Every structure is written in structure tokens, then in C-alpha cells.
Amino acid sequence: NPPPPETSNPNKPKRQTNQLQYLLRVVLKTLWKHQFAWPFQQPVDAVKLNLPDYYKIIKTPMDMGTIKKRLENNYYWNAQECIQDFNTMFTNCYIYNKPGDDIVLMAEALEKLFLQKINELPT
Numbered sequence: 847n848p849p850p851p852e853t854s855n856p857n858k859p860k861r862q863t864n865q866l867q868y869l870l871r872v873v874l875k876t877l878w879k880h881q882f883a884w885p886f887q888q889p890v891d892a893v894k895l896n897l898p899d900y901y902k903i904i905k906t907p908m909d910m911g912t913i914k915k916r917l918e919n920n921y922y923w924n925a926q927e928c929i930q931d932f933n934t935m936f937t938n939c940y941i942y943n944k945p946g947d948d949i950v951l952m953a954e955a956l957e958k959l960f961l962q963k964i965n966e967l968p969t
């Protein structure tokens with residue numbers, strides 16, 4: 847396994863915003879409770895899952911556990927930076943797999959709910 851993505855970085859500037867707080871309290875914590883969230887709550891463990899090709903294909907891994915820790919630590923400058931981590935997570939799943947696969951159906955469902963909730967953010 848590669849090291850998981852950083853959740854803190856002392857030479858990157860931090861910021862808290864109403865939108866970033868909404869992404870943690872409302873968006874992330876609601877997606878977390880969805881029945882399809884469990885593949886996406888932690889970095890992919892390629893050793894445990896026997897996916898030795900996973901990190902041969904995926905060069906920018908992302909997961910909701912990493913995102914959650916970045917929000918809690920105020921790692922992000924703005925909401926868009928965080929939204930991009932969500933998009934990387936969903937697109938990784940479509941890249942590493944095939945249309946119709948069970949994991950893809952799960953990601954497809956979560957992406958729809960994710961888009962519903964970021965449709966309107968706080969001001």
C-alpha cells in the first residue's frame with residue numbers, strides 16, 4: 847500500500863468558511879450514513895482486498911475518511927477544493943472499474959446524492 851493522502855500540511859494555508867462547515871456537517875456526514883457509503887469511508891486497502899493492481903491504476907486516490915479528516919483539520923482553502931476531492935473519489939471508482947459493476951452502482955448513487963446536497967450551499 848502507498849501512504850494515505852495527507853490530512854494536514856503545515857506549509858499549506860488553512861481556512862474555515864460557512865460552506866466548508868456545511869460540507870462536513872451536512873454533506874459528508876449525511877453521505878456517510880448511506881447504505882452504499884462503506885466502500886468509500888477509508889483509503890482502499892489493496893493488500894487486504896487483494897487488489898494489487900489498484901494503485902497501479904489509481905494515482906490520485908481519495909476517500910471520504912481522508913476528506914472527513916481534512917475538513918476537521920481545516921485543511922481546505924475553500925469549498926471547491928473539497929468538492930474536487932469528492933469528484934476525484936467518484937471518478938477513481940469509474941476508472942478502476944466497469945459500467946454496471948456493483949461498486950460503480952454504489953458510487954453512481956452516492957454521486958447523485960452528493961450533487962443534490964451541494965446544489966445550493968450557504969452564502
Ligand SMILES: CCN(CC)CCOc1ccc2c(c1)C=C1c3c(ccc(OC)c3O2)C(=O)N1C
Pocket residue numbers: 884885886887888890895938939942943949
Ligand atoms: C468500511 C470498512 N471496511 C471494513 C469491512 C470496509 C472495506 O472497504 C472496502 C471493501 C471492499 C471494497 C472497497 C472498500 C472499495 C472499493 C472496491 C473497488 C473495486 C473493487 C472492490 O472489490 C472487488 C472494492 O472493494 C473500488 O473501487 N473501491 C473503492
